[model samples]
Target: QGFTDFDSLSGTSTTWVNELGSVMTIDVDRKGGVTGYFVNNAPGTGCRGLPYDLSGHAHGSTIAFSVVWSNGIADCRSATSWAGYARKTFGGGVQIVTQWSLAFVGKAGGKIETGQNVFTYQA
Candidate 1:
């Protein structure tokens, strides 16, 4: 991975609230990998997918990653990819924005979703 330095982005968790009111967290690792978690506020009504395991590559201040959820609630089962850019804020923290594309599976067939999100990180 000719991307960026993994250590520089490690030990930080970026969080955001999705449109469905789910809280999502992305935990970055030092080995060019990420673990994701989603907490659904509406439980049975919303995406009840489990956390995702993702692999990524860093290119300078940008990162691209892919994830697949093997098990999930009806609407939340899918595979996705995210392309994001990170920058340092004036407050010395990191901010990231990502564009994501997803392909729903099983009963949600032929449904492709796309969205963008903003995430802020603290040291």
Candidate 2:
């Protein structure tokens, strides 16, 4: 129950690489205030694979966050939300496996897409 090490997910020195080889950096506080950056390795159209801002909170083994792609780019003007849990691997290190929802607001009409990814501790 209380086994999840929330502190491990709360540092700028901590970085992780997801299944898509994308980079994620998080800075969470003891108060559960979460902030981070996500670099999309598979950015399409106006997405330049830059660092997108993330903000959310962590609760025990469960965590959730959201990002809005509004960084002076078109086709990339959308929002993404992720919800999941974190756990330490059997061998060592930690991982955050999550499912994310992306808003596909392109040109005019918009839609939503969903995917899942596992974030393994890198550094």
Candidate 3:
């Protein structure tokens, strides 16, 4: 089973994309929840702008598309639109998770990032 909580998954099999289009998976098994991961792609693996080659776009690569997890319930899993950044709460803390970019042949692509603001809570 996948580990739960940031403390358990901190040093686990978390992978981050490096500069060479290669990935570095760390094993943070005993730390706080994950905050974020960096994705650095190779020259041609990323997107490009009209006048410049976007090989070094810090957050351009398409990573995982959806964000999903069990809400500590047996039958309470849910998903929402991943069009942009999201703020969510898990284990009593705010989290910011990113989604993959949606690319349509000749149209502009869009990337998403989601997070939860710890200072604001309705309930």
Candidate 4:
């Protein structure tokens, strides 16, 4: 249920890119604290073309993290939490298979949405 080789997550200081071209860079500490920034690619949203602050914890393969959309930029303010496992894809490559939930407060108010994304390691 957990990834014991967390140290592999630090050397580890690499860019993970998704299909949307959003990039994620993470730093995993010895105490299992996860810190990173997610560059969002939303074209017109408040978080559009912004680097959202990412913070969370890592336990084994489970890496729970969240990104806060900048409300100051626009009315589209929301926070997304992602839960997934970090593991090897085929050979020495790493991939994160996870799903995320979003609570968005935009022109209307708050709403819920869920989606999944796979992050592949980028050299």
Candidate achieving the largest TM-score: 2
> For residues 22-120, what per-residue lDDT tens digits would candidate 4 score against the true structure?
788888887878887888764454566666678888766678889887635543467888888887766677777889898987678789999987888
What does candidate 2's lDDT look like per residue over 11-123, in tens digits? 44467788777887888887878888887776453455788888888877777888887655534668889898887787677788899998876677899989998888874
Q: How well does each candidate superpose onto the true structure, as a TM-score?
A: 0.60, 0.82, 0.22, 0.81
- Per-candidate local distance difference test: 0.61, 0.76, 0.29, 0.75
Which runs in model 1 stand beyond 4 Å of their true positions?
1-7, 10-45, 71-75, 106-108
Worst 10 residues of 3 by lDDT: 49-58
Worst 10 residues of 2 by lDDT: 1-10
At residue 65, candidate 3 shows an lDDT of: 28
Tens digits of per-residue lDDT for model 1 on 1-123? 222443465776667554545455666776656666655453443345455455666545777777665534444566778788876666556656789887876664568778886655533
**lDDT tens per residue, model 3, 1-123:** 322233444434544332244332333323222233222233553321111101111122111222232223321132222222224455443222443332222234443434321111122
Q: What is the lDDT of residue 6 in candidate 3?
A: 31
| TM-score between model 3 and native | 0.22
Model 4 residue 19 CA deviation in Å: 1.8
Off by over 4 Å in 3: 16-24, 33-39, 42-96, 99-123
Model 4 TM-score relative to the real fold: 0.81
Q: For model 4, what is the alpha-carbon lDDT of residue 34?
A: 83
Give the candidate order by descending TM-score. 2, 4, 1, 3
Which of 1 and 4 is the better model by lDDT? 4
Q: Which ranges of candidate 2 are over 4 A from the true structure? A: 1-3, 7-12, 43-46, 73-75
